[PDB]
Amino acid sequence: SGPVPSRARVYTDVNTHRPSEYWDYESHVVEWGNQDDYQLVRKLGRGKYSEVFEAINITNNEKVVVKILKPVKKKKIKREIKILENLRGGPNIITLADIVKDPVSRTPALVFEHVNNTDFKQLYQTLTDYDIRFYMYEILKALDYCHSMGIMHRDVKPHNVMIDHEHRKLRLIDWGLAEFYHPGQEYNVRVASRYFKGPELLVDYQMYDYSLDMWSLGCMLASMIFRKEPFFHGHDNYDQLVRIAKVLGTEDLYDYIDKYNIELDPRFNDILGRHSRKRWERFVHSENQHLVSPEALDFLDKLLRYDHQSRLTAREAMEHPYFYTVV
Ligand SMILES: CCCOc1ccc(CN)cc1Cl
Numbered sequence: 001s002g003p004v005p006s007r008a009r010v011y012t013d014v015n016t017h018r019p020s021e022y023w024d025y026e027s028h029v030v031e032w033g034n035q036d037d038y039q040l041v042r043k044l045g046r047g048k049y050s051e052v053f054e055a056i057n058i059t060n061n062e063k064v065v066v067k068i069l070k071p072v073k074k075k076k077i078k079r080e081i082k083i084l085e086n087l088r089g090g091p092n093i094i095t096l097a098d099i100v101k102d103p104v105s106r107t108p109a110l111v112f113e114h115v116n117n118t119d120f121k122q123l124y125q126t127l128t129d130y131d132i133r134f135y136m137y138e139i140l141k142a143l144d145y146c147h148s149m150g151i152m153h154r155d156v157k158p159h160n161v162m163i164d165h166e167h168r169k170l171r172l173i174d175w176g177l178a179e180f181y182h183p184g185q186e187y188n189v190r191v192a193s194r195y196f197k198g199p200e201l202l203v204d205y206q207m208y209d210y211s212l213d214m215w216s217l218g219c220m221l222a223s224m225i226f227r228k229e230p231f232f233h234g235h236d237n238y239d240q241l242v243r244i245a246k247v248l249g250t251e252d253l254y255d256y257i258d259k260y261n262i263e264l265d266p267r268f269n270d271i272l273g274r275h276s277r278k279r280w281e282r283f284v285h286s287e288n289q290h291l292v293s294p295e296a297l298d299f300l301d302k303l304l305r306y307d308h309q310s311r312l313t314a315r316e317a318m319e320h321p322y323f324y325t326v327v
């Protein structure tokens, strides 16, 4: 009979009702500018798909961020460009400012707005309960916006969240794995970083949606409020589901597999075992109790659910009592 189909509970048909120009990235015309307007300043980081640099726009002495793209399918570069162009100016979304190529190497490069990621290690003040609520709300604004625009980020994790704490500014970056949501489409499950992969990815359920980002956000919330990084510490993709099952329990996992008629990989036979569903209160310790509250655990419980359909949407999350105190 095969797996039972699924579709997003929200923003289901936003790409369906838009003209193809919006979501047909393969047909998008990229106009590559000239990289001489920029001087590279320093190396910011290295990724699987890119090298990120701090730079100066020499025409106006303004700091920019330059992402030089590593060898990848032309289709993937076009997808990222089109998504960034569609989301440009959205709340807490990194802003694409220019698309350039070095006249000699012809290597593709994306130019973005500068974001000054705070060195948190050099602050007397440690993370507070209010800080978590404030920045979790800013991420949600970004996710509700991109989901409303028919886009799944698919790589929500701390390294893809830039925070300028002095200006209380947050930006969701690296749209390289992002994809347009089309109801009924079967997606590649080899997305997201291991610790942040949703159970749908781990059981190879391809008909996933925006709710994938909500699981990733829940992993980030658990790691912050409990001071346990990462929260689900798998050593491989199969072991990752086992770490999740040791907290959410095996009974709800079998209800999830049964509901969607999911074919479970035989590699899971000898490793899943039997696990009770743990209370979230059991992760509270003297070192994290200032970040934990009944509201925070109720909110966490509503994100970290096997059933992608039963997770809060980004808009439902924004209305949770956990955020009543945020501006
Ligand atoms: C007007 C709806 C078009 O539907 C799609 C567009 C693009 C894709 C990805 N190849 C899939 C679908 Cl169903």
Ligand SMILES: CCCOc1ccc(CN)cc1Cl
Binding pocket: 117, 120, 127, 131, 132, 133, 135, 136, 157, 158, 159, 160, 161, 162, 163, 220, 224
């Ligand atoms: C809730 C506040 C902590 O969250 C962060 C702090 C710094 C960074 C830098 N990538 C990212 C996150 Cl999510």
Ligand SMILES: CCCOc1ccc(CN)cc1Cl
Binding pocket: 254, 257, 258, 263, 264, 268, 269, 270, 272, 273
């Ligand atoms: C530990 C492996 C068990 O495998 C399964 C468990 C539950 C279901 C749903 N009837 C299916 C499988 Cl293969």
Ligand SMILES: CCCOc1ccc(CN)cc1Cl
Binding pocket: 294, 295, 298, 321, 322, 324
């Ligand atoms: C915002 C006030 C606190 O909210 C709660 C208190 C208790 C529970 C259940 N133990 C849930 C919530 Cl949201």
